[PDB]
Amino acid sequence: RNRREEILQSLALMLESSDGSQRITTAKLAASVGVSEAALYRHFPSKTRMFDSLIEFIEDSLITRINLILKDEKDTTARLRLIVLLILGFGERNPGLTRILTGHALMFEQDRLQGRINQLFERIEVQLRQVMREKKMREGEGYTLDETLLASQLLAFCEGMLSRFVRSEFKYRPTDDFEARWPLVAAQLQ
């Protein structure tokens, strides 16, 4: 119930906190939830599972809002801008999950989990390319450069900002100066 979600909420908070640079032991996670280690296992079979649930929430949040953007906004460049802003905004709003997105928190857990995060990035990049491929249809002319190069370029930018947010103890917020940065990023869309 609120207990399962509660554990998850405490895990994200520890991830966001200074404890997030260290492994989140079941002991430490249990202490933070206010219950015993055993209590944790009534709701999850493993710690691996808790990260899986956190990753599911990240994928759902991002994929669902990406589709929302695609249905509401039809301008290709506007689409690109909004998806990038959504990723940075989502990361900034959830520092602990960003720590999962950048791979850092997963260093202590199952290699499979980083695999999940890589698939999520591939999905996002795949959507980026698709948006780019509709421009010719949408406005008469496509981009001159390879969409695969442009999309990796956009994602590289997002991953770079998230990585900085993480190394800086979350001081370098991902959306800071977004308005001044986007124009620079868009200049690449040739």
Partner DNA sequence: GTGAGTACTCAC
| Interacting residues toward a copy of itself by CB under 8 A | 21-23, 102-105, 107-108, 111, 114, 117-118, 121, 145-146, 149-150, 152-153, 155-164, 166-168, 177, 180-181, 184-185, 187-188, 190
Cα–Cα distance between 51 and 56 in angstroms, integer? 8
The reply to whether 35 sits near DNA by the rule CB under 7 A is: yes
To a copy of itself, the closest distance from the beta carbon of 72 in angstroms equals 27
Interface pattern 114-143 for DNA (x via CB under 7 A): ------------------------------
| C-beta of residue 147 within 8 angstroms of C-beta of residue 132 | yes
Instruction: Give Dmax (Cα) for the chain.
Output: 62
37 binds, among a copy of itself, DNA, none (CB under 5 to 8 A by kind): DNA
| C-beta of residue 17 within 8 angstroms of C-beta of residue 99 | no
The reply to whether 36 sits near DNA by the rule CB under 7 A is: yes
* Size of the residue set binding DNA (CB under 7 A): 17
Cα–Cα distance between 27 and 40 in angstroms, integer? 10
Nearer to a copy of itself, 31 or 70 (CB): 31
To DNA, the closest distance from the beta carbon of 16 in angstroms equals 17
Nearer to a copy of itself, 68 or 108 (CB): 108
| C-beta of residue 15 within 8 angstroms of C-beta of residue 100 | yes
CB atoms near residue 175 (< 10 Å): 17
Q: Is 134 helix (H, G, I), strand (E, B) or coil?
A: coil
Q: For residue 190, what is the DSSP state?
A: -
144 binds, among DNA, a copy of itself, none (CB under 5 to 8 A by kind): none
Cα–Cα distance between 176 and 190 in angstroms, integer? 25
Using CB under 7 A, list all residues that contact DNA.
23-27, 35-39, 41-42, 45-48, 108
